[PDB]
Design a protein around this ligand. Structure first.
Ligand code: NA
Ligand code: NI
Ligand code: NI
Length: 279
C-alpha cells in the first residue's frame, strides 16, 4: 500500500530531505586522497547528531554498523566505513581514498520521525575519462527519470527512460558502454525507510500510477561492465560488481507535485530545479 503524505508530513519530509542534502554539502571538503571512510562516518555522525539534532537511520534501525554508506570504485552500494583496506577473499574491500577513486556517500537522516535519503559521487584527484563518464551518465539517468515524473505517469516509465538513456549512450559511445544493476531498487519512503512502491531502474511495464503526495527514491546504479553484483558473505553488506569494474550511483528523495516533482534532497551545487513542471 503506497502512502499519500498530508501537508504536515510533506513539511517534515522537506526538512529531512534538506538535512540529508546538507550532510553531503558539509562533508565535501573532507573528501580527498588519504582520508579513511571511518573518518567521514565520524564527521557525518557528529554533524547529524550534534548540529542537525537528527538520527542516522542505517546505524539505529537497519543493523548497519555505521552512520553512512561509503562505496568506492567496484563497490556498488552498502560500503562500510573502515580505518583500513581489507579483502573479501581476493576482492579488495577499500576504506582509504586514493587518487583516481570514485566515492558514493549515501546518507539517510531521520528528523521528527521522517526520512531523507540521498547519495552522490565524489571524484578523488585526477580521475580517468572512463570513470568521469560513468559518474556523469549515472547522474543523467537520474535527471532524465525525474523529468518523466508527474501524476498519471506509470512507474514503469522511470526504468524505461533510464534503460533508453543507457541504450543510447552504448550506441553513441561503444568505448564507454554501461549496464543497469537489477538487484536493487528505489522505494516509497516516509515515516518508514522501506515503503511501497519498489522503483526498478531497467525497462519494465509496472502499471502503478504516480499520484500527487507520493514520496519515493530514484537511485540508479550504473556498472562500467556487466550488470551482475556479488554480496560480501563475510560482512553481510558490501555489494561488489561481479566483474570487478566500477559502479556509480546518485539518489534523490522526490515528492510528486500537481505538475511534476519536488527534489527534497536537491543540493546547492546541482543545476537541476528543485521543482520540475513536467506537464
Ligand atoms: Na562504486
Ligand atoms: Ni540511500
Ligand atoms: Ni534509498
Amino acid at each position: 500500500s503506497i502512502k499519500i503524505k498530508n501537508a504536515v508530513e510533506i513539511e517534515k519530509m522537506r526538512v529531512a530531505g534538506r538535512l540529508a542534502a546538507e550532510v553531503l554539502e558539509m562533508i565535501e571538503p573532507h573528501v580527498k586522497a588519504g582520508v579513511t571512510t571511518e573518518e567521514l562516518d565520524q564527521i557525518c555522525h557528529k554533524y547529524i547528531t550534534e548540529v542537525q539534532g537528527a538520527i542516522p537511520a542505517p546505524l539505529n534501525y537497519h543493523g548497519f554498523p555505521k552512520s553512512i554508506c561509503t562505496s568506492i570504485n567496484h563497490i556498488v552500494c552498502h560500503g562500510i566505513p573502515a580505518s583500513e583496506d581489507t579483502y573479501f577473499g581476493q576482492i579488495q574491500r577499500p576504506a582509504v581514498l586514493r587518487d583516481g577513486d570514485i566515492l558514493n556517500i549515501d546518507i539517510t537522516v531521520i528528523k521528527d520521525g521522517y526520512h531523507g535519503d540521498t547519495s552522490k559521487m565524489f571524484l578523488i584527484g585526477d580521475v580517468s575519462i572512463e570513470d568521469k563518464r560513468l559518474c556523469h551518465v549515472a547522474q543523467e539517468c537520474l535527471y532524465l527519470a525525474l523529468k518523466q515524473v508527474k501524476p498519471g505517469v506509470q512507474l514503469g516509465e522511470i526504468g524505461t527512460t533510464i534503460e533508453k538513456h543507457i541504450k543510447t549512450n552504448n550506441k553513441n559511445n561503444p568505448r564507454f558502454k554501461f549496464s543497469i544493476v537489477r538487484d536493487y531498487c528505489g522505494h516509497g519512503i516516509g515515516a518508514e525507510f522501506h515503503e511501497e512502491p519498489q522503483v526498478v531502474h531497467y525497462k519494465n511495464s509496472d502499471r502503478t500510477v504516480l499520484r500527487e503526495g507520493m514520496i519515493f527514491t530514484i537511485e540508479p546504479m550504473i556498472n562500467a561492465g556487466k550488470f551482475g553484483c556479488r554480496l560480501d558473505d563475510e560482512d553481510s553488506w558490501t555489494v561488489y560488481t561481479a566483474d570487478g569494474k566500477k559502479s556509480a550511483q546518485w539518489e534523490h528523495t522526490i515528492l510528486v507535485t500537481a505538475t511534476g516533482c519536488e527534489i527534497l534532497t536537491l543540493r546547492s551545487e546541482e543545476s537541476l530545479p528543485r521543482i520540475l513542471n513536467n506537464a
